[PDB]
RNA sequence: CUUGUCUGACACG
DNA sequence: CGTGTCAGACAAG
């Protein structure tokens, strides 16, 4: 029941400093040593450093210190992470392990804060059906900043034979395409409706 | 500073099957302890990594004893046998031995199953984005295997290989297939100067490409 | 559960 | 040289 919750996404502008969160439940938080991690959307993983919750001592990765400072409030069961002077390179996925023994290997992990560095603007996306020329359907969200859209079909239902690809990235927009494949009793008949909801410009919703 | 590298970067296997992943390490993990502080970590898609392997050899709560860890020195095996399809994901080794913890590359598990054939879809430019000077067409190829597919683009009978979009998704885990979107976004001023527009893919499945096509 | 320990980390003196 | 906190392991009573 330990579980591991970190802050929500984040975009700031090259040249910045930025905090991560990651609270702690199910635990003694001031027991067990605290581990960050990095992994580059696509990419493996690189360890960061680790803080002895009970004293706030921290051991950084030689290449990290600079980029990242370990601090906590004990009190809170809240662990932060600091990045200050932010590149292109480190806009990735920032994990949250604890550690098992000896503050060198991790057993759980956070669900991971995606942080993306870039001075490009909020866009709101922009939701187009797909009609044919069983049959398949499909919903289109083009030019958006910055990740994450959530796509979900009546409302979170139709969950099977929907295909949701990743978002491909093209002159600082977004790009998202999903397809639902349906029986053919269904679309002259019944309606399926998309919904997309962008959490930082809108949250639009239109049927086929 | 060492370094990890996985000898399998991609390895199909079939239901039952067992696989051997092997991470040899760059020096010695053998820390003054006499033990060795190497982990195998699962990351299933959509996801963030779960721990599986923890000594070189012990398995973490959670584990069956399909997953064994071998190996000592600079040569470690992970054996994951009788295979399942919820044990998609790349596996990485991690040493927690000297002073940066580093992982391995990875290792792309990726279940072997028939040969299926795309369900390509093609879809013309939207009514509501041709009003805003932009034509999109989008392209499926949905529910195939192997995940070697080319897609291709004709404007107007030409190879138009400019301002494409390919997306592809993980091995789904029921299905066990691949599904891929490309997308041709043009003007309308440039969309409305031609009429046939295609999208082909040539996979194993097929003598043939497989073509779709439409004129408005 | 109790006793005798082994081990890694961090803080501190 | 030592001291404290923290955990994960142990053998034996």
């Given at each position: 029941?330990?579980?591991?919750?970190?802050?929500?996404?984040?975009?700031?502008?090259?040249?910045?400093?930025?905090?991560?969160?990651?609270?702690?439940?199910?635990?003694?938080?001031?027991?067990?040593?605290?581990?960050?991690?990095?992994?580059?959307?696509?990419?493996?993983?690189?360890?960061?450093?680790?803080?002895?919750?009970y004293?706030?001592?921290?051991?950084?990765?030689?290449?990290?210190?600079?980029?990242?400072?370990?601090?906590?409030?004990?009190?809170?069961?809240?662990?932060?992470?600091?990045?200050?002077?932010?590149?292109?390179?480190?806009?990735?996925?920032?994990?949250?392990?604890?550690?098992?023994?000896?503050?060198?290997?991790?057993?759980?992990?956070?669900?991971?804060?995606?942080?993306?560095?870039?001075?490009?603007?909020?866009?709101?996306?922009?939701?187009?059906?797909?009609?044919?020329?069983?049959?398949?359907?499909?919903?289109?969200?083009?030019?958006?900043?910055?990740?994450?859209?959530?796509?979900?079909?009546?409302?979170?239902?139709?969950?099977?034979?929907?295909?949701?690809?990743?978002?491909?990235?093209?002159?600082?927009?977004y790009?998202?395409?999903?397809?639902?494949?349906?029986?053919?009793?269904?679309?002259?008949?019944?309606?399926?409706?998309?919904?997309?909801?962008?959490?930082?410009?809108?949250?639009?919703?239109?049927?086929? | 500073?060492?370094?990890?590298?996985?000898?399998?970067?991609?390895?199909?296997?079939?239901?039952?099957?067992?696989?051997?992943?092997?991470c040899?390490?760059?020096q010695?993990?053998?820390?003054?302890?006499?033990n060795?502080?190497?982990?195998?970590?699962?990351?299933?898609?959509?996801?963030?990594?779960?721990?599986?392997?923890?000594?070189v050899?012990?398995?973490?709560?959670?584990?069956?004893?399909?997953?064994?860890?071998?190996?000592?020195?600079?040569?470690?095996?992970?054996?994951?046998?009788?295979?399942?399809?919820?044990?998609?994901?790349?596996?990485?080794?991690?040493?927690?031995?000297?002073?940066?913890?580093?992982?391995?590359?990875?290792?792309?598990?990726?279940?072997?199953?028939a040969?299926?054939?795309?369900?390509?879809?093609?879809?013309?430019?939207?009514?509501?984005?041709?009003?805003?000077?932009?034509?999109?067409?989008?392209?499926?190829?949905?529910?195939?295997?192997?995940?070697?597919?080319?897609?291709?683009?004709?404007?107007?009978?030409?190879?138009?290989?400019?301002?494409?979009?390919?997306?592809?998704?993980?091995?789904?885990?029921?299905?066990?297939?691949?599904?891929?979107?490309?997308?041709?976004?043009?003007?309308?001023?440039?969309?409305?100067?031609?009429?046939?527009?295609?999208?082909?893919?040539?996979?194993?499945?097929s003598?043939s490409?497989?073509?779709?096509?439409?004129?408005?």
């Open positions: 029941e330990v579980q591991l919750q970190q802050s929500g996404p984040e975009l700031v502008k090259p040249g910045a400093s930025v905090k991560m969160s990651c609270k702690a439940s199910g635990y003694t938080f001031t027991s067990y040593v605290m581990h960050w991690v990095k992994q580059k959307p696509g990419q493996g993983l690189e360890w960061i450093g680790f803080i002895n919750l004293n706030d001592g921290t051991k950084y990765n030689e290449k990290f210190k600079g980029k990242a400072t370990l601090t906590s409030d004990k009190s809170s069961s809240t662990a932060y992470m600091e990045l200050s002077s932010l590149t292109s390179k480190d806009s990735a996925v920032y994990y949250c392990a604890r550690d098992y023994y000896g503050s060198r290997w991790f057993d759980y992990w956070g669900q991971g804060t995606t942080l993306t560095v870039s001075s490009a603007k909020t866009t709101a996306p922009s939701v187009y059906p797909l009609a044919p020329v069983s049959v398949t359907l499909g919903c289109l969200v083009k030019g958006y900043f910055p990740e994450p859209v959530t796509l979900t079909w009546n409302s979170g239902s139709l969950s099977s034979g929907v295909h949701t690809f990743p978002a491909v990235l093209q002159s600082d927009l790009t998202l395409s999903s397809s639902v494949t349906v029986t053919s009793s269904t679309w002259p008949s019944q309606s399926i409706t998309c919904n997309v909801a962008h959490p930082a410009s809108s949250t639009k919703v239109d049927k086929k | 500073d060492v370094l990890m590298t996985q000898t399998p970067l991609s390895l199909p296997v079939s239901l039952g099957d067992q696989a051997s992943i092997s040899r390490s760059s010695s993990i053998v820390h003054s302890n006499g060795t502080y190497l982990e195998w970590y699962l990351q299933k898609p959509g996801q963030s990594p779960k721990l599986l392997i923890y000594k050899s012990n398995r973490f709560s959670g584990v069956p004893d399909r997953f064994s860890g071998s190996g000592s020195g600079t040569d470690f095996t992970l054996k994951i046998s009788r295979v399942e399809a919820e044990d998609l994901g790349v596996y990485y080794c991690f040493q927690g031995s000297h002073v940066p913890y580093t992982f391995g590359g990875g290792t792309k598990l990726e279940i072997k199953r040969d299926a054939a795309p369900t390509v879809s093609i879809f013309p430019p939207s009514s509501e984005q041709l009003t805003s000077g932009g034509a999109s067409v989008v392209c499926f190829l949905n529910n195939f295997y192997p995940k070697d597919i080319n897609v291709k683009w004709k404007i107007d009978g030409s190879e138009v290989q400019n301002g494409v979009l390919n997306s592809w998704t993980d091995q789904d885990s029921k299905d066990s297939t691949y599904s891929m979107s490309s997308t041709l976004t043009l003007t309308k001023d440039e969309y409305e100067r031609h009429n046939s527009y295609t999208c082909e893919a040539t996979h194993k499945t003598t490409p497989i073509v779709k096509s439409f004129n408005r």
